[PDB]
Tab-separated table of C-alpha atoms and ligand atoms in Angstrom:
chain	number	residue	atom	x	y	z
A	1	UNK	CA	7.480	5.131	-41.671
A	2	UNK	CA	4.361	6.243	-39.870
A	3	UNK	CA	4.118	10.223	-40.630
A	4	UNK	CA	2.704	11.166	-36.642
A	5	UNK	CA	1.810	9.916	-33.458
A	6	UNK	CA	-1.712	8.496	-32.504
A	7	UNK	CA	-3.653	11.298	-30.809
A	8	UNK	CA	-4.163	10.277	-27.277
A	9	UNK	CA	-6.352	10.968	-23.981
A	10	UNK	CA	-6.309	9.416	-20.831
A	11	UNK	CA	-8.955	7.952	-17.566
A	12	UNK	CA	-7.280	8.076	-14.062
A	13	UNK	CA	-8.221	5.998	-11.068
A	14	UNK	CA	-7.701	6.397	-7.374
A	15	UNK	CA	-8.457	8.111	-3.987
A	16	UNK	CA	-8.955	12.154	-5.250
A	17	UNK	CA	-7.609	13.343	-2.049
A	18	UNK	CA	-3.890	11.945	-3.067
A	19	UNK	CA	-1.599	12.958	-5.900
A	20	UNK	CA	-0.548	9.374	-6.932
A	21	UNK	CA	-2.721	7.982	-9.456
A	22	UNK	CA	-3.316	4.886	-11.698
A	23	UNK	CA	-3.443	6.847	-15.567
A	24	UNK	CA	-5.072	4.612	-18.451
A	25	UNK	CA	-3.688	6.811	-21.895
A	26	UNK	CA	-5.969	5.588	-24.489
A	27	UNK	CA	-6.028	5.805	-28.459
A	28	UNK	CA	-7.902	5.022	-31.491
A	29	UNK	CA	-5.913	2.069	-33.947
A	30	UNK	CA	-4.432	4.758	-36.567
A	31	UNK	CA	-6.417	4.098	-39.566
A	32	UNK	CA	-4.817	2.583	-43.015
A	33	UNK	CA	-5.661	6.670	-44.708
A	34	UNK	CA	-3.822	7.865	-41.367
A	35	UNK	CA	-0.367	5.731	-41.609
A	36	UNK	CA	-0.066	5.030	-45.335
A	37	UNK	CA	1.463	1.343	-44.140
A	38	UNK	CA	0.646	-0.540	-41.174
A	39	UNK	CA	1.320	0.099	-37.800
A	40	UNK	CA	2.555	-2.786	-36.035
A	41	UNK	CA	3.138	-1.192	-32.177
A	42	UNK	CA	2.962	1.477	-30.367
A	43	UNK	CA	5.474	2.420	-27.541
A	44	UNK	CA	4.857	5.054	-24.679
A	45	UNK	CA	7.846	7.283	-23.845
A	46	UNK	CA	7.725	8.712	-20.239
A	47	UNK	CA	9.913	11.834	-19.254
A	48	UNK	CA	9.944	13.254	-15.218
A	49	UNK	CA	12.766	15.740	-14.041
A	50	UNK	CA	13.962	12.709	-11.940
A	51	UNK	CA	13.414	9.352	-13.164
A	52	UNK	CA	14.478	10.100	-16.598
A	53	UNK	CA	13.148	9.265	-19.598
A	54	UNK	CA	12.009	5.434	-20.179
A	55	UNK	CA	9.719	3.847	-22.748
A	56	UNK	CA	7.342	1.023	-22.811
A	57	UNK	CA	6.374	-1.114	-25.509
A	58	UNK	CA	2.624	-1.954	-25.439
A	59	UNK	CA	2.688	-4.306	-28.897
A	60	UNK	CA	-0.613	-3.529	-30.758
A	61	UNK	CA	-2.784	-2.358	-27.467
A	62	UNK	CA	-4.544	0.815	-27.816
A	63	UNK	CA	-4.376	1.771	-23.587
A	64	UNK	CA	-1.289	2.348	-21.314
A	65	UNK	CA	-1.737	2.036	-17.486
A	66	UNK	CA	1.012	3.418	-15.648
A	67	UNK	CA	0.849	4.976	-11.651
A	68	UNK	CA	1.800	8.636	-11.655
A	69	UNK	CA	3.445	9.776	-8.323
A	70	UNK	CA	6.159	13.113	-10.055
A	71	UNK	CA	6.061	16.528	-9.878
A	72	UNK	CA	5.119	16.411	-13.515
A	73	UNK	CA	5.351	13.831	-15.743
A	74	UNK	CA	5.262	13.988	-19.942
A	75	UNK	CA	3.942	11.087	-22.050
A	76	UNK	CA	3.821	10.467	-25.538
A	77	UNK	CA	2.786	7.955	-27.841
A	78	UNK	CA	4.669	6.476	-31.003
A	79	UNK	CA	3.606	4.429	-33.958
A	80	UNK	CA	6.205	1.648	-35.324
A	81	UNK	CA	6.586	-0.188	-38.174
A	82	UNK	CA	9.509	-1.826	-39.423
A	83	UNK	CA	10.805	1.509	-41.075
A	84	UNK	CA	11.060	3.107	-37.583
A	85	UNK	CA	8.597	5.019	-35.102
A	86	UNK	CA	6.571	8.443	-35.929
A	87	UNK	CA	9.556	11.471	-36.002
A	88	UNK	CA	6.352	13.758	-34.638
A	89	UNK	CA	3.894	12.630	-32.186
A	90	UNK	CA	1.444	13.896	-29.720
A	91	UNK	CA	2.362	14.867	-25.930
A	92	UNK	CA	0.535	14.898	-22.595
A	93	UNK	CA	2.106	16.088	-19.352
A	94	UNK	CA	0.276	15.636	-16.175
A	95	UNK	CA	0.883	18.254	-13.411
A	96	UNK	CA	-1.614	18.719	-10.684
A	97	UNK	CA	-0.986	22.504	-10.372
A	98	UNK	CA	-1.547	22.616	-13.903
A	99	UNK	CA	-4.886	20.790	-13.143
A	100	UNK	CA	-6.194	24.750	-11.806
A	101	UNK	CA	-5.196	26.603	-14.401
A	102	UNK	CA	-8.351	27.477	-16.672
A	103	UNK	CA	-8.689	28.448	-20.136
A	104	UNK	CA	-12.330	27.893	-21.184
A	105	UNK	CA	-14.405	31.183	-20.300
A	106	UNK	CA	-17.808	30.186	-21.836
A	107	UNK	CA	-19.293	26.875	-22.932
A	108	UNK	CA	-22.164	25.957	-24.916
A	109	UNK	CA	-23.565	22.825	-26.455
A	110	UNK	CA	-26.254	22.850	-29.298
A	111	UNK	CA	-28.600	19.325	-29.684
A	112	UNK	CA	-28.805	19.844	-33.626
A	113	UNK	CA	-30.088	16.380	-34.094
A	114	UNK	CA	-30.145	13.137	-31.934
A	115	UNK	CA	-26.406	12.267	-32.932
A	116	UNK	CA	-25.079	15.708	-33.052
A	117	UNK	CA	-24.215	18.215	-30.999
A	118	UNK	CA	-22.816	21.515	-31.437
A	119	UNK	CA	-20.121	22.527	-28.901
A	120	UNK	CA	-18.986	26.486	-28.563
A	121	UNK	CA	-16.710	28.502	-26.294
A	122	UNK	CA	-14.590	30.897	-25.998
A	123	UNK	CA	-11.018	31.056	-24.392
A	124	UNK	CA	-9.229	33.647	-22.281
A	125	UNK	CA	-6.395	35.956	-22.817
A	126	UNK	CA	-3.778	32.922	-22.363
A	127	UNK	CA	-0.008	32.935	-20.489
A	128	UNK	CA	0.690	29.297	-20.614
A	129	UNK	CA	0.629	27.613	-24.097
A	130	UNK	CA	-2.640	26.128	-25.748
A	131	UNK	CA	-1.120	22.540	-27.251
A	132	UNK	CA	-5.205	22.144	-27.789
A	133	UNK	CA	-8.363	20.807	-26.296
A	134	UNK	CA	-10.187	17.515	-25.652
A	135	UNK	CA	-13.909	17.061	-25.108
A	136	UNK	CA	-14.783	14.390	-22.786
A	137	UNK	CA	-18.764	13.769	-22.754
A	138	UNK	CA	-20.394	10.826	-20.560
A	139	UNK	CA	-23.859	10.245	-18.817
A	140	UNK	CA	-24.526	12.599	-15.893
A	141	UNK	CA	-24.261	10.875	-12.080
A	142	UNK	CA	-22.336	8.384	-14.166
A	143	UNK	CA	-18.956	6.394	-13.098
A	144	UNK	CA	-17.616	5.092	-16.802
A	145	UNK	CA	-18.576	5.100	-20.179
A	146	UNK	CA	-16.505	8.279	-21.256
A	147	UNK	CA	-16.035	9.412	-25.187
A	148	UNK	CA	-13.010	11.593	-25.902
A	149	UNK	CA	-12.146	13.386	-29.142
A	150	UNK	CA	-9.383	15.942	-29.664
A	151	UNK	CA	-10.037	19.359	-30.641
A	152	UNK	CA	-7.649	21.881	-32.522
A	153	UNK	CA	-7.169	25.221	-30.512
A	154	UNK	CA	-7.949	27.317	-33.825
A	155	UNK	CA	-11.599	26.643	-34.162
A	156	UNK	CA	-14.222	28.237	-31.853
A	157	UNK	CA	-16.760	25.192	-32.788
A	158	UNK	CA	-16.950	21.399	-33.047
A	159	UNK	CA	-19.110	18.566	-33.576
A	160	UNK	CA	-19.632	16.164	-31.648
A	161	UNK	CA	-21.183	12.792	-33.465
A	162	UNK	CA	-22.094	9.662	-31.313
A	163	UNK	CA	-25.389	7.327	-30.754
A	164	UNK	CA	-26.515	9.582	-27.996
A	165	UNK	CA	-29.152	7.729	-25.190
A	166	UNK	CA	-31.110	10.711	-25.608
A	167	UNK	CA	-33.117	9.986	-22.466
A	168	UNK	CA	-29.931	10.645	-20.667
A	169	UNK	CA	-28.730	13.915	-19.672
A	170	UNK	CA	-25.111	14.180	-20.752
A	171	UNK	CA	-22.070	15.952	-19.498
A	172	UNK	CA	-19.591	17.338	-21.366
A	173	UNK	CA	-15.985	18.472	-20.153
A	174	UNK	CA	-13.865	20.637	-22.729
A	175	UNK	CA	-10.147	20.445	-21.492
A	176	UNK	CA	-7.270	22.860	-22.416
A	177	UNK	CA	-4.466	20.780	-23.236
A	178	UNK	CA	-1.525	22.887	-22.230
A	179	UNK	CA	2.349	22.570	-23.167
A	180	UNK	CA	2.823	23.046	-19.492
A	181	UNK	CA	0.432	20.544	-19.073
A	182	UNK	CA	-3.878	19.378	-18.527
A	183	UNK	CA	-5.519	22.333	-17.656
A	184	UNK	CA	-8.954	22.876	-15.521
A	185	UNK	CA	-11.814	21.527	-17.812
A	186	UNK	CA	-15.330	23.856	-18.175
A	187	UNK	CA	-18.220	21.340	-17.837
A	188	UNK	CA	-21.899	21.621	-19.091
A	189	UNK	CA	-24.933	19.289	-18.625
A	190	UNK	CA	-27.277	18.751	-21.367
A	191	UNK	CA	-29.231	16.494	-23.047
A	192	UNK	CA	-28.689	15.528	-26.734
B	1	UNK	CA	-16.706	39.471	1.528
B	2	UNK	CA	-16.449	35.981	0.938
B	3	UNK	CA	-17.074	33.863	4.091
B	4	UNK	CA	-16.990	30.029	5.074
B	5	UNK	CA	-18.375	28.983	7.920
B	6	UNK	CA	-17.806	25.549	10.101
B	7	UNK	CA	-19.697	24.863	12.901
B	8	UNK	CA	-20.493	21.149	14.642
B	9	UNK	CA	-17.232	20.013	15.819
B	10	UNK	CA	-16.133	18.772	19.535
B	11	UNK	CA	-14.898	15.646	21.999
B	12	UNK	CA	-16.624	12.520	20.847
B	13	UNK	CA	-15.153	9.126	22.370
B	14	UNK	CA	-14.756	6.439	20.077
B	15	UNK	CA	-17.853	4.745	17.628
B	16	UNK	CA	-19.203	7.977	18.110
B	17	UNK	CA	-20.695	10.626	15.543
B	18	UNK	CA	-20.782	13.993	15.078
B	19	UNK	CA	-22.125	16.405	11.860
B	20	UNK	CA	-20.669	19.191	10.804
B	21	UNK	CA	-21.739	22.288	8.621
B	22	UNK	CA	-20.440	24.969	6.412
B	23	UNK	CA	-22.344	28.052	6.037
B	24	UNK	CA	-21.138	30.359	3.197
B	25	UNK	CA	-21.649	33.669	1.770
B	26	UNK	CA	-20.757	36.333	-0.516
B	27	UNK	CA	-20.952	33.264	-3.305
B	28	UNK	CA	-22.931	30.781	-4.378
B	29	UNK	CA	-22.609	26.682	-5.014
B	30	UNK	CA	-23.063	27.745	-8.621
B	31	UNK	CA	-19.225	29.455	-9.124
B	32	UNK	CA	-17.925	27.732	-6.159
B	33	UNK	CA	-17.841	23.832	-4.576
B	34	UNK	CA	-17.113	23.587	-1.476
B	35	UNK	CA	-15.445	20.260	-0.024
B	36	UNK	CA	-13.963	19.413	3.391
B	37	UNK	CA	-10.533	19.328	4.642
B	38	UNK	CA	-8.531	18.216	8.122
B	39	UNK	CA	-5.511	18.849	9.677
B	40	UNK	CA	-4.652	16.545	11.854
B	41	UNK	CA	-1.790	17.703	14.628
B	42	UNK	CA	2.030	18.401	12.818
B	43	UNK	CA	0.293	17.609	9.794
B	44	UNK	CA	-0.729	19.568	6.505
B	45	UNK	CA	-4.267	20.217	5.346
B	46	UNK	CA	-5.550	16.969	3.699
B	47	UNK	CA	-8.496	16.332	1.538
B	48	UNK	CA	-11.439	14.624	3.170
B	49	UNK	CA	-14.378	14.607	0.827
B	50	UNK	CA	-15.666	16.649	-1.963
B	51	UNK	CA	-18.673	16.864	-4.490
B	52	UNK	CA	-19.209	17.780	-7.993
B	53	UNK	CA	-19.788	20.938	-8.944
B	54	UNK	CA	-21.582	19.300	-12.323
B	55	UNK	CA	-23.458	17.158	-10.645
B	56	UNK	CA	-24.166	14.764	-7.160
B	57	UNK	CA	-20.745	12.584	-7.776
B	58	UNK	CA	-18.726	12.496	-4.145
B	59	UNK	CA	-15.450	11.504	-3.370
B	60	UNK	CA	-13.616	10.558	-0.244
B	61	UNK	CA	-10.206	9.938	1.422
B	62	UNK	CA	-9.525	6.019	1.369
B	63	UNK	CA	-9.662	6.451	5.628
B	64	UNK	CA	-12.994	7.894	5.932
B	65	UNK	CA	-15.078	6.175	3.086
B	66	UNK	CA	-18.528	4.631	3.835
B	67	UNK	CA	-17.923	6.769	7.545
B	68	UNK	CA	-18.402	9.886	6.091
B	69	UNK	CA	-21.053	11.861	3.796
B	70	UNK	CA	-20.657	15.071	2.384
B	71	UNK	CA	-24.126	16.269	0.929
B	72	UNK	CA	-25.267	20.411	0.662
B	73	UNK	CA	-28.369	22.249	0.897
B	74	UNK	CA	-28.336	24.448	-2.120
B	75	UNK	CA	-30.901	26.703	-1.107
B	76	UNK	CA	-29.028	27.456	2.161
B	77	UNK	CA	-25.786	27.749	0.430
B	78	UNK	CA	-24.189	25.044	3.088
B	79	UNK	CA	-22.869	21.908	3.243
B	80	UNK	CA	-22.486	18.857	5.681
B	81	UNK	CA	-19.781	16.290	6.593
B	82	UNK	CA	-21.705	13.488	8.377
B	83	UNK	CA	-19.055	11.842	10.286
B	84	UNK	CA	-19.579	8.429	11.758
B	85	UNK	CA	-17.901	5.383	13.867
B	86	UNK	CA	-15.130	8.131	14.484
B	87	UNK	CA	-11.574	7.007	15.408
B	88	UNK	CA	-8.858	8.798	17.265
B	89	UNK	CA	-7.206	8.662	14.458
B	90	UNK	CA	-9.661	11.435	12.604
B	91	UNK	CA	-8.892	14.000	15.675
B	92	UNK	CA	-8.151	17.005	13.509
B	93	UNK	CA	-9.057	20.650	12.867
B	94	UNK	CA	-11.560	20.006	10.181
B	95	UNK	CA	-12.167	23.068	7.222
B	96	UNK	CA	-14.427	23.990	4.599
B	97	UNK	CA	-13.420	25.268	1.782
B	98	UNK	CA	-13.941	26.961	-1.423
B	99	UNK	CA	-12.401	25.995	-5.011
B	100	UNK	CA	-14.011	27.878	-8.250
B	101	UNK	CA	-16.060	25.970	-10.331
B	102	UNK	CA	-15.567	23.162	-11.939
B	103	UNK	CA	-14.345	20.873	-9.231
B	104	UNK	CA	-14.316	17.565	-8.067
B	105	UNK	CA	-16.022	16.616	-11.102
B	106	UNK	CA	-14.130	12.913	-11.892
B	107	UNK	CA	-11.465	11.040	-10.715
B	108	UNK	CA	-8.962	13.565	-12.989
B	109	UNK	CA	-9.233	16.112	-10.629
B	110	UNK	CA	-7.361	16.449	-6.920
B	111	UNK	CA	-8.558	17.559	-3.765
B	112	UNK	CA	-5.702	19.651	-2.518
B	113	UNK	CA	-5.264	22.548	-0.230
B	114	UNK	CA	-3.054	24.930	-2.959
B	115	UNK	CA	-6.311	24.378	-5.346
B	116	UNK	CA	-8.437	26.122	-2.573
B	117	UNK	CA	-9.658	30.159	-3.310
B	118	UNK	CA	-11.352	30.607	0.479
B	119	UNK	CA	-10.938	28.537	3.894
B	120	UNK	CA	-13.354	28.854	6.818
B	121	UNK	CA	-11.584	29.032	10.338
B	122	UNK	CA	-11.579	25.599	11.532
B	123	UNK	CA	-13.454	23.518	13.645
B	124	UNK	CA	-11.497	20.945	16.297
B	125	UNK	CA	-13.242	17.642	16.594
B	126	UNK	CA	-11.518	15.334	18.991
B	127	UNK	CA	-12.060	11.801	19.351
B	128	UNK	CA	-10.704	10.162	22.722
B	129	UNK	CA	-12.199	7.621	25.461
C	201	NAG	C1	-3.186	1.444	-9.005
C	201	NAG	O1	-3.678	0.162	-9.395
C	201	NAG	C2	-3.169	-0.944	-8.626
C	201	NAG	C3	-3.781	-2.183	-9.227
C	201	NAG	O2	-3.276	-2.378	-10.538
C	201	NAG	C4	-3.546	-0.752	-7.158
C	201	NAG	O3	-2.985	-1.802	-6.378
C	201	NAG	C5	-3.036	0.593	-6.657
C	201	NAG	O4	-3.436	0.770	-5.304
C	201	NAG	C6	-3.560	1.720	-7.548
C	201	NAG	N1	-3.020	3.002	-7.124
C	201	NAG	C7	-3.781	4.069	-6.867
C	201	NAG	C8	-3.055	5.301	-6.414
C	201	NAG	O5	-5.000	4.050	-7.019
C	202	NAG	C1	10.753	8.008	-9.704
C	202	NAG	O1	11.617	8.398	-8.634
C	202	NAG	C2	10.911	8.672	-7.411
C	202	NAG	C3	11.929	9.192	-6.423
C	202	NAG	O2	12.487	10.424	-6.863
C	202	NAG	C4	10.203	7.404	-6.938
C	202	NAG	O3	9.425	7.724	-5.788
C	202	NAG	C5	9.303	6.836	-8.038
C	202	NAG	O4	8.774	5.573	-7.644
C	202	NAG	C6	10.065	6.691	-9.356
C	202	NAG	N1	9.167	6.292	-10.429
C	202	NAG	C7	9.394	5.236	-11.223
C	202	NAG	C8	8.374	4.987	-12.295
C	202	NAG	O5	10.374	4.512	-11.080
């Protein structure tokens, strides 16, 4: 039986000025080290106040596209093998209110080398819940080519390794994850 | 004091442009963006257009797209909504607004009027023959 969840981000789509939105989750294939036995699918499990709670099976796929229109809405993504699906597993709830609630006061990122950079921050004197935080980085004035990777909410510090275009400027966006929901990201420019 | 500023607005018949502006103070574009709003009559404040406060990245309502432009003039601490091949449809009171920093940075974030920290009074534009 797969031990957890895949950790998950998302990519949304649509006109900014309207809440309804087309959300692409996406993961990484859990690793053989990361599930002990294979993973044969993976299954999103939606949850709103008043639709319910309704899952979708999306075979061996690592995206989900599904159009958010609630209030709030929770996802969460499950591994399965033929022994059952991950007990424990990772959770995302989108709430646009949630969306302006910030958590990052300071941000820094270090250019150690040409494939790594050194991120920093510190966080505020919290009410809602730190789950944790994901880094987004992508190429300034850019529409796609977004890299994700999830940080815990202990550390103060991460690195961030990739094949950098170093004549690009990047820009990186370090979102709280909260249990309430996505929180307002704090976004840097820099080069790498 | 914080202050927003519109100015620009007025009766334009139909195909017609008009520009409008946003003067602020007591801020700067660096802790604040400021995007554009309208309330058309009975209706609620909607978002119009926005841009980053990361970089030059813009984003519109599906109705005014390609018709309108929001740019800024950093140094002036204002911004623009060039408005063209207006409908009577886009008759509204039309605000500026301020959101702290960072916003409309991607297409994860949501122009909305509860998001907003300052509004400027209003300007009316009217479009009829
Ligand atoms: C979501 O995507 C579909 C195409 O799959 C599109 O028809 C629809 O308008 C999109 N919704 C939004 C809110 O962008
Ligand atoms: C959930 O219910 C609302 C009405 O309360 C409806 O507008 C929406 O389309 C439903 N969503 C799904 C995924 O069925």
């Amino acid at each position: 039986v797969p031990m957890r969840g895949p950790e998950f981000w998302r990519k949304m789509d649509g006109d900014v000025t309207k809440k309804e939105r087309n959300v692409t989750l996406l993961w990484k294939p859990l690793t053989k080290q990361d599930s002990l036995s294979s993973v044969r699918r993976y299954v999103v499990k939606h949850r709103t106040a008043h639709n319910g709670t309704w899952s979708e099976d999306v075979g061996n796929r690592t995206q989900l596209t599904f159009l958010w229109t609630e209030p709030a809405h929770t996802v969460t993504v499950l591994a399965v093998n033929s022994l059952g699906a991950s007990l424990v597993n990772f959770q995302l709830t989108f709430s646009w209110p949630m969306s302006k609630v910030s958590a990052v006061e300071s941000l820094s990122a270090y250019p150690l080398s040409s494939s790594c950079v050194i991120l920093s921050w510190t966080l505020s004197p919290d009410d809602y819940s730190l789950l944790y935080l994901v880094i987004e980085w992508k190429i300034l004035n850019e529409d796609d080519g977004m890299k994700w990777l999830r940080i815990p909410s202990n550390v103060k510090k991460f690195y961030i390794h990739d094949n950098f275009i170093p004549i690009e400027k990047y820009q990186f966006s370090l979102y709280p994850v909260f249990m309430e929901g996505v929180g307002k990201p704090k976004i840097i420019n820099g080069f790498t | 004091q914080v202050q927003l500023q519109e100015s620009g607005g007025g009766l334009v018949q139909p195909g017609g442009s008009l520009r409008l502006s946003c003067a602020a103070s007591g801020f700067t574009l660096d802790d604040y963006g400021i995007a554009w709003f309208r309330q058309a009559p009975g209706k609620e404040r909607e978002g119009v257009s926005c841009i980053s406060t990361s970089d030059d990245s813009t984003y519109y309502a599906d109705s005014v797209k390609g018709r309108f432009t929001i740019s800024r003039d950093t140094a002036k601490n204002t911004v623009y909504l060039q408005m063209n091949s207006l409908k009577p449809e886009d008759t509204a009171v039309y605000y500026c607004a301020a959101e702290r920093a960072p916003m409309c940075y991607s297409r994860s974030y949501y122009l909305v009027d509860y998001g907003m920290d300052y509004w400027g009074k209003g300007t009316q534009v009217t479009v009829s023959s």
